[PDB]
Write a protein that binds this DNA or RNA. Sequence first.
DNA 1: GCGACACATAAAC
DNA 2: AGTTTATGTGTCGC
Length: 290
Amino acid sequence: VILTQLNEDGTTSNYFDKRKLKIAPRSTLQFKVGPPFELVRDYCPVVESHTGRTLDLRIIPRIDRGFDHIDEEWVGYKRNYFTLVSTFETANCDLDTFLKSSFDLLVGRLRVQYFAIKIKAKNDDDDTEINLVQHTAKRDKGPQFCPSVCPLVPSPLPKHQTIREASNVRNITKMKKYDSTFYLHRDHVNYEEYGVDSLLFSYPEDSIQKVARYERVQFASSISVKKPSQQNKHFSLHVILGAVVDPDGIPYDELALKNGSKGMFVYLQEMKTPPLIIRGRSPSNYASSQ
DNA sequence: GCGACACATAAAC
DNA sequence: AGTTTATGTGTCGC
């Protein structure tokens, strides 16, 4: 009934079929590593502004809630939360150096203001985009919102156990414990060490995330989970790393910029999951029917 | 099949 | 040690 795999950090992922077994909502058995991500492609090259060195980039994503591996399929539930986390790394540049440097897109050179991640859901068979929604912990007693673009600096991805532990922390002392893992506070650096043109100082806010954490995520309530043939639709979750540039023929999305104008999120790299099945609200998707 | 409201139960403190 | 929080899911009414 429960199939167990050891995660990288020694925690377990415990896969079970909610059609057959009901587990408590706050059980640690609801936390588990989801499907592994794969490269879709690399897009615009990025170079350091004096050396000309190409910046090596890699997205490091993981799903930590919401998906079970059940007989060779990855299965989620429309009504339930998933968690998708991601960082990125720069193989050839340590963070401290990276933040003092400046970088251009090779298209002919657009200056990078900052790096950021976004996520999307798609129908994996036809590339149609599917809406995602997020809640706060208050769920129906708080607002609903669509996942946002997350400015980020390079960082290792926290272990599954760390994401689990930090999921519902309010206590101030405990929050302090995790702060350095999730945030860089630009207002606490020595400003005299940095040039006006430095990458750190073109980030839009002082509080800069080191990890993009999309928690309490669902597919939009209106998604059809089956095809007309009654076969399951196949979905995929995508993570896109971009460079945000000032707007004034390569893939990009428009972005609501800080100063009011509309800039460009220029694609750098994209990863996606294998095909995903989503179980809808039908009673037959739950053990209560049996 | 979906929005709303309800109940239940382990985590968080 | 008890209370509140957070979240899977049961149920009602259209």
